[PDB]
């Protein structure tokens, strides 16, 4: 058996703040994938999050 | 992101331990229900239902014991 | 002190829902609006009527 | 709607195995009854009825055996 | 509203799994009562009554097991 | 006029308004089963309903007690 | 990807033990059905059916005994 | 007024008022059959009657026990 | 060696007491699975498995009694 | 306050996987790509397809 894989992910957070004023930005999201054999109804997912 | 405590960690170890049993028991029960008398379905289901019973017992008793070990220490701060 | 309560209401429901299944050659199964596996004698339909 | 279990699937295996016997016996009966005392008829009838008896007995005994295998497995669920 | 619990949802599986057995049994008995000496009918009824017996056993045993799994967990809140 | 309800009352009420109809389903089941005890269709249903009722009542009580003891422990420290 | 407990292993030991019996029984019945009146076929089926019945029993009784042990050990954590 | 009866009493009595006359029918058939033990029409009757009576008394006692346990579990938590 | 407590010593006394049962019980199973219908094999396995059952239950109960003695003494240091 | 969300995704899978094991004459067991050999008696390999 021989196998190869390639992956690439680019993320941009953008925040507006005043001078000298502290600020925060916080987010998370979930992405799902449909498992095979849809009669065998199931999902897989993962959550990505950044602060 | 959400908050999870020490007892949640202890509990979760079991869930991630028994990888698929939660789905196995459901599908084995539907396959049995389709033909309520087939020796291979009965023999499979008896196993999976037993493994499930033991899993839920060991999980809940462990979490109980840890709760008491903590309460016994907190009491002494007073 | 006077307290008064008045109420009126009118309701109507009417029509049908259909579902069913067919087996051909015992080799291809076809089913119509069924969320479940089928017993493959086929040629089996239901019309649920409400009025 | 024509639901069938595993015991049904076994019984029908005999009924669809002995292709025609149920009609063959019914024919031989009427032939013999129409003109009894014919050795040619009697000889055939004996054979057909004799093996029809075995067919029915074998079928019913097989089904009972299976039934008690399943009941014994179900008893261990508790 | 037809409020149903977990045990209710379990039990209902078997009722929908045995699509028609409930009616089939009653009909087989209805006809056999009119002619008890037809073996073609006795053989049918033996199978349907066996299927019925096994179905009602498996159903009530499974419900009983899940009751104990729940009660065991509830007990540990204290 | 209407009852004052505390907090524990709210907790109990969550269960009472959770099982919308079980309280009466159980009674109807019993009435017909007692009318014709030898029917396995009646029996198979009543077994389920009675078990659900048992679990419901048990969980409700155990929960209330836990909240009682948390409150009691906080109140003790006022002194 | 499967997941198997200890009771799963114990059970599967019998399945991998009896290499082919589950097919052997089905084919012996298959040919017998075609000729229920043959002694050699009856004599073969009588054996296979028995081997199978004993196999299924010993399986389910062992799995129960193990479940009963574990359930008694876990009880002592609390 | 009437002899005091609780919840369990009022549950048990439900069965008795459910099987309106079975308690008599059983003794009736028993006497008729004892009159002529070798009569198939009597035997086939008494088999049914006695089976019904057995199932009834059994299911009654089990249900009363379950409703005792549900209460005791609650009472224990008062303290 | 790793750290071992007094309860560990007590536990291990049993394991080292039953020198070989731990494996005898497995070999017996591997053999019996080969021919589930040999009474000479069954008569042996019944014994080994009964012994194993009693061994594990005595072990756990003993451990618990010593845990509750120690806990009762530690309580009074305050 | 305007809040906007946009999302697009493409997913594709194609091809076949081969695995299996065959008993040869009561002489040798041979198996391909089984991670712990189920060692079925007799023979049959299986090709699993999705698209």
The CA distance from E31 to E41, in Å, is 8
Which residues fall within 8 angstroms of residue B31, CB to CB, at 6 or more apart?
Answer: B41
**Which of F52, F56, F67 to probe the E interface (max E CBs under 10 A)?**
F52
Chain D contact for E68, CB < 8 A?
A: no
CB–CB contact A1 J33 (8 Å): yes
Listed in sequence order, the residues at least 6 apart from G74 whose beta carbon sits closer than 8 Å to its beta carbon are B54, B57, B58, B61
Q: Which residues contact I61 (CB under 8 A, 6 or more apart)?
A: G76
Give CA–CA dist D61/F22, Å, rounded: 46
Return the CA Rg of chain C.
Answer: 22
**Whole-number Å distance between alpha carbons of E77 and I1:** 39
Give the up-direction half-sphere exposure of residue J14: CA atoms within 13 A in the CB hemisphere: 2
Contact G8 B43 (CB under 8 A): no
Q: Kindly give, in sequence order, each residue whose CB lies less than 8 Å from that of residue C32, ignoring residues fewer than 6 positions away.
A: C18, C19, C20, C21, C45
Can you tell me the distance from the alpha carbon of B51 to that of C32, in angstroms, rounded to the nearest whole number? 38
Resolution in A: 3.3
For chain H, the helix, strand and coil percentages under 3-state DSSP, each to the nearest 5 = 80, 0, 20
CB proximity list for F41: less than 8 A, separation 6 or greater: E22
**Residue D1 sits at the chain E interface (C-beta within 8 Å):** yes
Nearest to H8 by CA among H65, H53, H57: H65
I36 contacts G54 by C-beta, under 8 angstroms: yes
- Report the alpha-carbon distance of residue J29 to residue J42 in Å, rounded: 10
Q: ∠ CA(J15), CA(J16), CA(J19), 5° rounding?
A: 160
Show the CA angle centred on residue H64, arms to residues H79 and G75, nearest 5°: 55
Cα separation of the two ends of chain B: 33
Q: Around Cβ D55, how many Cβ atoms within 10 Å? A: 20
- Measured distance CA(F49)–CA(E5) in Å, rounded: 9
**B&D contacts, CB < 8 Å:** 20
CB–CB contacts below 8 A, D to G: 39
Task: Taking the CA atoms of G28, G31, G32 and G38 in sequence, report the sign of the dihedral they define.
Answer: negative
Residues pairing with G15 in the sheet: none
Q: How far apart are CA E53 and CA E56, in angstroms?
A: 5
For residue I47, what are the domain limits? Answer: 1-78
Partner-chain contact G7 B50, CB within 8 Å: yes
How many degrees, rounded to 5, is the angle at CA B49 between CA B43 and CA B52?
A: 145
Tell me whether D63 touches chain B (CB under 8 Å). Answer: no
Using DSSP's 3-state secondary structure scheme, residue B2 falls into coil
> Closest approach of chain D CAs to the CA of E45, in angstroms?
10
Integer Rg of chain F from CA = 18
Q: Report the domain count for chain I.
A: 1
**Smallest Cα–Cα separation from H26: which of H49, H60, H1?**
H49
CB contact under 8 A, D58 and G36: yes
State how far the alpha carbon of C14 is from the alpha carbons of A23, C8, C49, D72, F21, in Å: 58, 21, 8, 51, 28
Tokens of F18: 């959770």
State the Cα–Cα distance between residues G60 and G51, nearest whole angstrom: 15
How was this model experimentally determined? cryo-EM
G18's tokens: 């009896």
- Which positions in chain B touch D77 (Cβ < 8 Å)? 46, 49
For A13-38, the DSSP string reads ------TT------EEEEEEEEPS-T
Q: Chain D interface, mutation test: which of G33, G34, G52, G66, most D Cβ atoms within 10 Å?
A: G33
Q: What are the residues whose beta carbons fall under 8 Å from the beta carbon of D12, sequence distance 6 or more?
A: D4
- Residue I6 Cα distances to B34, B69, I9, I12, I70, angstroms: 54, 20, 5, 10, 11
In whole angstroms, give the CA distance from residue B18 to residue G5. Answer: 9
Supply the DSSP string of chain G, one letter for each residue. -----HHHHHHHHHHHHSSSHHHHHHHHHHHHHH-TT-HHHHHHHHHHHHHHHHHHHHHHHHHHHHHHHHHHHHTTT-
Q: Which neighbouring-strand residues pair with H26? A: none
């Amino acid at each position: 058996l021989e196998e190869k894989k390639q992956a690439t992910v680019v993320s941009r957070p953008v925040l507006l703040t005043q001078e000298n004023v502290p600020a925060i930005f916080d987010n998370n999201r979930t992405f799902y994938t449909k498992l095979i054999g849809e009669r065998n109804v199931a999902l897989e997912h993962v959550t990505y999050g950044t602060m | 992101t959400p908050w999870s405590g020490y007892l949640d960690d202890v509990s979760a170890k079991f869930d991630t331990g028994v990888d698929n049993l939660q789905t196995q028991v459901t599908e084995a029960l539907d396959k049995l229900a389709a033909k309520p008398s087939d020796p291979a379905l009965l023999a499979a289901y008896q196993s999976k239902l037993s493994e499930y019973n033991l899993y839920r017992n060991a999980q809940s008793n462990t979490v109980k014991v840890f709760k008491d070990i903590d309460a016994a220490i907190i009491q002494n701060f007073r | 002190l006077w307290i008064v309560d008045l109420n009126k209401s009118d309701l109507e429901r009417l029509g049908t829902s259909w579902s069913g299944s067919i087996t051909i050659g015992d080799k291809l199964g076809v089913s119509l609006n069924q969320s479940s596996i089928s017993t493959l004698d086929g040629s089996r339909f239901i019309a649920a009527v409400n009025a």
